[PDB]
Design a binder for this molecule. Structure first.
Ligand SMILES: *[C@@H]1O[C@H](CO)[C@@H](O[C@@H]2O[C@H](CO)[C@@H](O)[C@H](O)[C@H]2NC(C)=O)[C@H](O)[C@H]1NC(C)=O
Ligand code: NAG
Ligand code: CA
Ligand code: CA
Ligand code: CA
Ligand code: CA
Ligand code: CA
Ligand code: CA
Ligand code: CA
Length: 147
């Protein structure tokens, strides 16, 4: 956050500016070393916008081993759909040619074939499936703070 005085004279610091305080994308950018690090952090930050307090809750949301809300923050390793179909690699163009990818959604961490929710689908983290007849399907990932 910018407490309009001389704070913007200091080197950016993610802990001070974006974790202990809410921040704008540009503040995150100023605190990071690349656009790549900035797109990833921003996607995580906005996906956890409402899991801001306490800090332990925010850190769990940002780590992403569980889904918060619709799971846009999810960064775990589940790679199978809820019906048990093995996920297709995001980078593969077979058996489905992805219309969502690294370029369209930078920051979403579309890696290997891990379930992700880059588009905010209301049914949660999903993946393109290796079944030729089922383009995509959601996955089963723990909800943050569940049981
Ligand atoms: C989740 O998946 C990631 C990515 O494959 C695993 O981390 C990688 O593990 C390999 C082998 O241990 C390393 O060569 C890579 O450097 C790791 N990638 C990184 C650092 O992102 C990770 O171990 C997996 N964790 C779980 C929950 O199984
Ligand atoms: C993502 O999809 C676009 C649109 O089809 C395509 O032009 C581009 O090459 C793809 N990029 C990646 C990251 O594969
Ligand atoms: Ca500040
Ligand atoms: Ca600031
Ligand atoms: Ca700054
Ligand atoms: Ca701190
Ligand atoms: Ca402060
Ligand atoms: Ca600034
Ligand atoms: Ca700037």
């Amino acid at each position: 956050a910018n407490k309009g005085f001389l704070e913007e004279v200091r080197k950016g610091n993610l802990e001070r500016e974006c974790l202990e305080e809410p921040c704008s994308r540009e503040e995150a950018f100023e605190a990071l070393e690349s656009l790549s690090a900035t797109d990833a952090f921003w996607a995580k930050y906005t996906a956890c916008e409402s899991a801001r307090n306490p800090r332990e809750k925010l850190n769990e949301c940002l780590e992403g081993n569980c889904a918060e809300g619709v799971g846009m923050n999810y960064r775990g390793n589940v790679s199978v759909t809820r019906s048990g179909i093995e996920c297709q690699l995001w980078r593969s163009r077979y058996p489905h040619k992805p219309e969502i990818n690294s370029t369209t959604h930078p920051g979403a961490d579309l890696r290997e074939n891990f379930c992700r929710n880059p588009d905010g689908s209301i049914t949660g983290p999903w993946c393109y499936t290796t079944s030729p007849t089922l383009r995509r399907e959601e996955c089963s990932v723990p909800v943050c703070g569940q049981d």
